[PDB]
Symmetry: D2
Subunit: 206 residues, 4 copies
């Protein structure tokens, strides 16, 4: 069966929710194993307690932790990260910085890579976070898949919404209060289904 | 006086309107000369008639045409382009491809470069069009100015809006029907005022 | 058979020579049909937007213009609006190669900004994996990036594409074709 | 006086050597105060987010990690939330330099993605203009981009930064300082 890994960091739960929607879309293709994996936290125990994040992260506390070498087991990996000033977050960056051995062994070469994100504002890194993420995936020799415009949600012009042709996204607001909308989750579902379709066509032809 | 040039291509008038708002913001600083300049059209006379664009472009028909060498006269240049698949349009690209002589003479080195855009969808090249534009400005040795988050419009979370920390923007919709909103025009005004402030501080210190 | 189109613009011939190396790499894989097409401002036919729909993969070649594709390529792609709204390139393999005057003036940025456009068309993006040894060459001035093959033209365009640069290009052709073929044979 | 901070992470010393060249370039201009600060995982003090507010310009140095800044730099910048909402870096000059194992594996993309973050902080971005002859060197393998200075470390990190690469770095320091100073003296 086609193995799809969804590897994400989340502080407030936005990326976690999008991840579940991505997973749901992927499972629609059939002959597919979808696995959610979270990246290790870096933030100090205390800062974590004081921020409330410790509480928020607990909502998905039972998700197993990703490791650099487990990535080699997948046919596709869809990475999720909140933006930090238009780049991936340091938690995701440290995790990927750890894939040096995976790199020299060629472990991700020819695998399908895709990305999704979340931001506080409408155009603060909705796109740049994804495209800079793509750079690292290309270093790993992955094939890059985004979200085609055959998904109607990408052209929605009546509600504020994330979702880019580079990859799905969601808006969290300044204070992280806004939860992902149905349009945003529909776009993520499509991404998971689309990535899984492509990975399966590649995987069934070793 | 500090010379600010606003150099743009527009098909349907969206970029033209944003350009006027950028100009208005710039004129707020004082001791500043602001000049609007349009880039030459490439589209065939016939395709132009049949598209209705010939009509739309006429609304700003009296704007003088930019040339590669006139750019050397400015202290800052703020470039406007509609997106084409997350890059600047071919009209703007051909114009900039013409600046080879300007490049070897160093004519734009140390000048303030800024960019604004327009797109059909919320995250189809709102950011990527600007950042890829920045690359060409860096080749010309320009100092890059975007839109700081001290402009409240960048964090607007109640209306669909363009405007990025990389540069102002507007949404035109799938059929180009949506006109620039007040929030979008306010952000452009701020960009013009902010670019002009910086250029003036640099220009008054040769 | 898998259909590969190599769509390019070339002034000095650097891009054309790279294209020939890409095509030879692609034609190594077997049951692969490669067509070279040039974009309009010599016996290479001109590309049209409609013909692109017939490919399983398109490998685009452009010299840089200040870190973007050239206006000739930009104008060509600006004519693919019809293809876009019909979904004509969705799921097809996209790949890019370039040429530049200087060692780091747009070797990378020209390709990555090109990728943006291929993503708008719903394409699947392929670069050059580091299993190609030429990417880590540290003994001779060389183009070639993980994002796609490249060549160095020099200030006056006198510099010929090197053997290292062409072999990277050959690899990109073979690798892109191998990917396209696996997709093409699994409709 | 104009205050320049050079904030960097260095493993092998390549980035540190580049920083020393940037600082020497900056200190050429006169009435310029340059401080080197390193980001946390040696007698260079550690950077903090609050000290950055005291600079007129910040020049950031990072080795690449697959075409992005390294996690140590990323984590440091992720702690600048307070600075951000207070507007503490708005209008300050920002500039970047890097180091990579291979000739086109993130020489450019590492810098341009760093620029994104500096733009979120409202900074004014400065690269390296082509009036610096080293940028067009075509005789020796060399780093140095119009986006910012760079050095090549090699696969094992054995390669020393060359004289061409350091002179480009020196230029970037001088050029950034010259810009910062003109702004600093025109409040």
């Amino acid at each position: 069966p086609t193995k799809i890994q969804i590897v994400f960091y989340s502080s407030y739960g936005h990326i976690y929710k999008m991840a579940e929607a991505i997973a749901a879309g992927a499972r629609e293709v059939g002959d597919v194993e979808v696995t959610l994996l979270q990246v290790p936290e870096l933030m100090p125990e205390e800062v974590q307690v004081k921020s409330g994040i410790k509480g928020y992260r607990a909502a998905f506390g039972s998700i197993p932790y990703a490791t650099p070498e487990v990535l080699a087991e997948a046919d596709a990996i869809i990475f999720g990260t909140p933006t930090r000033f238009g780049n991936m977050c340091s938690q995701m960056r440290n995790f990927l910085d750890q894939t040096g051995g995976l790199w020299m062994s060629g472990g991700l070469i020819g695998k399908v890579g895709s990305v999704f994100t979340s931001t506080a504002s409408q155009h603060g890194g909705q796109e740049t976070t994804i495209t800079s993420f793509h750079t690292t995936l290309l270093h790993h020799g992955m094939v890059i898949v985004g979200v085609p415009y055959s998904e109607p949600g990408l052209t929605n012009m009546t509600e504020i919404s994330g979702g880019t042709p580079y990859g799905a996204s969601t808006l969290a607001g300044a204070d992280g209060s806004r939860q992902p909308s149905e349009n945003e989750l529909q776009i993520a579902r499509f991404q998971g289904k689309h990535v899984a379709t492509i990975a399966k066509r590649l995987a069934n032809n070793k």
